[PDB]
C-alpha cells in the first residue's frame, strides 16, 4: 500500500505543438497499476490541451479552478468539484482561461500508458 | 460504445447510505458507475464523522484520493492518518480499512476495475 501527499511527486513539464502550459504528475503509474493509471494535471494560466482524440476514455475529476473542456465542436468550463467522463475516441481537450492554476485528476485504463 | 462526454458537478448524485457488515456512517456516490464504465468505475465516498470501514481485502485494487478531511487508513498492521491531496493504493488482496476520527465529514474518490461492482 502507497499514501503519498500528490504534490510531492515531481511533476513533469509539457511544452509540444499540442500541449502547453501543463505539468503532470504520475500519481499511480505503470510500475504499480493493474489496470489504470492515476495523473494529476495541473494547467498553469493560458494553459492548453489541445483537440485530440484516443482509443480509450478519461475518467477526470476536477480538484482546483474552473477548467475549459474542449469539445468536437465548441466548449464547456466547469468548477471544482466536477466529474467528467470522456467516451473512448471522443475528441476533447483543456484550456485554462483564468489568472490561476487548475487542477484536475485524470484517470485512463494502462493501455494508454501512464 | 457509445460516443460524447459526460460533465456533471459530483453532489448533483445524492449520497445512498452504506451499512453492511464491516461498514457503517458512510455514504457513496456512484459518479461513473457500471452503466457507462468501460473499464473501471468512479466513486465518491463520504465518512460520516466516527464512521469506519472496517479491515477487509478483495480480489482487485483500490485507488484513491482525498478530497477532504483526515482519512485514517487501517493497515494489516497499525495505521496511517493522511489528509485531504493525498492518494493511496491498495494492491489487490490487501488488507485494509478506513475511520473518521474527526467531527466532520471526510470524502474521497475510489476507483476500482469494474469487475468489482460499482
Ligand atoms: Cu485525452
Ligand atoms: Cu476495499
Given at each position: 500500500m502507497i499514501l503519498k501527499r500528490?504534490?510531492?511527486?515531481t511533476p513533469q513539464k509539457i511544452s509540444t505543438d499540442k500541449v502547453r502550459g501543463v505539468r503532470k504528475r504520475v500519481l499511480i503509474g505503470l510500475k504499480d497499476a493493474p489496470n489504470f493509471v492515476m495523473r494529476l494535471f495541473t494547467v498553469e494560466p493560458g494553459g492548453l490541451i489541445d483537440r485530440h482524440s484516443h482509443p480509450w476514455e478519461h475518467e477526470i475529476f476536477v480538484l482546483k479552478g474552473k477548467l475549459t473542456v474542449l469539445k468536437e465542436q465548441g466548449e464547456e468550463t466547469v468548477e471544482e468539484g466536477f466529474y467528467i467522463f470522456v467516451e473512448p475516441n471522443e475528441i476533447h481537450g483543456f484550456r485554462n482561461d483564468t489568472d490561476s492554476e487548475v487542477e484536475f485528476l485524470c484517470l485512463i485504463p494502462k493501455e494508454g500508458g501512464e
Open positions: 500528490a504534490y510531492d511527486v
